[PDB]
Design a protein around this ligand. Structure first.
Ligand SMILES: [Zn+2]
Ligand SMILES: [Zn+2]
Lengths: 220, 220
């Protein structure tokens, strides 16, 4: 793969969103990956509905504001024959009755691919596919108050990662000699969190925060 | 006990602080309780050093930015014969070598009292003692993005509560007919979090978030 990738430069990535008081990060992660693949397919960047996922993907295994998996959301889009735009089906940060309307569907997928649990494999996927849905351990104040630089947390778990996010690239920091590699990660905690809503996560440091352990992307 | 208590009105409580990128909430919880008891004793409200706790209370069982217990901090203050002011020993949000200086000690304790694991018992303690150190489950985005009203999270755990905070009172909301009781809780996530750095937590709803399960106060 190349030494540094950033899909935001290529137009694959919508501005940062905010999940608010709802455990819906899986939905934001899934729409981010699907936004990337739809852009690759059509050349149109269109913001997708997390609320559509929160409301409607119960049958595939998701639980609205009480958690879910990106794969289950990709499975729902396949089963459902579509997904509504953010504009047509806006974000409410609470689970409600399904209101999917096929007239406003702007996205499709035919399934998903799970990536092998290795940072080498994640890197090849990020390089060649686009933004990748991943789950991380986000449960430390070091992450809550992250501002800049490469995030490294010596208590980070690589098991049962709670928080769905989006890898949009990777790179390295020139000015630091050791441990200088990072994943470029889009969060769903608003623009005011972290670096404009982004975090540089430690890369190739024993799968820090479990970042490569639950990585996947939708097929469109 | 009375129907509503708020120790902030009585002068027991310093302004809200920010723990930053460090798992030191136990230290903020402990200084808050000790600030309350010292004020009761002397009539002087003095901000106490969390950094002093982070740096120096290893021998009593604490682990700096990787966690700790309020009881271990109360034990350290007893063993150490004092605790420095915030001003003399400022907050750095990282563990460093102990720099305690007895010339700047402004607080003392002779131990601590653990409260029985019941909200009835917590209420009697808050009513008659002052601000009470407690641990809660803070590990949901519903808490991260809490803004106002009574916080209630149907997935909240009452086991292994991670996050040390300070109960400064309790009350009830008039305009709501059911589930209207709350604990008034000081956090250490800055003034910009929650309601000026405070949260109203559901009270008498089956020990929501484990709030009564690890409650204590220092004896001064
Ligand atoms: Zn999350
Ligand atoms: Zn905490």
């Amino acid at each position: 793969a190349p030494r540094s990738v950033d899909w935001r430069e290529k137009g694959y990535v919508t501005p940062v969103k905010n999940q608010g008081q709802c455990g819906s990060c899986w939905a934001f992660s899934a729409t981010g990956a699907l936004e990337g693949q739809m852009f690759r397919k059509t050349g149109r960047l269109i913001s997708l509905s997390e609320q559509n996922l929160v409301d409607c993907s119960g049958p595939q295994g998701n639980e609205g504001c009480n958690g879910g998996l990106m794969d289950y959301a990709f499975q729902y889009v396949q089963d459902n024959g579509g997904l509504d735009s953010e504009e047509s089906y806006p974000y409410e940060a609470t689970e409600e009755s399904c209101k999917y309307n096929p007239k406003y569907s702007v996205a499709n997928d035919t399934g998903f691919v799970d990536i092998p649990k290795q940072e080498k494999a994640l890197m090849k996927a990020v390089a060649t596919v686009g933004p990748i849905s991943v789950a991380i351990d986000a449960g430390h104040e070091s992450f809550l108050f992250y501002k800049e630089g490469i995030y490294f947390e010596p208590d980070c778990s690589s098991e049962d990662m709670d928080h769905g996010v989006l890898v949009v690239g990777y790179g390295f920091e020139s000015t630091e000699s050791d441990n200088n590699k990072y994943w470029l990660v889009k969060n769903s905690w608003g623009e005011e969190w972290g670096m404009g809503g982004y975090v540089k996560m430690a890369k190739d440091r024993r799968n820090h925060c479990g970042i490569a352990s639950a990585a996947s992307y939708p097929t469109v």
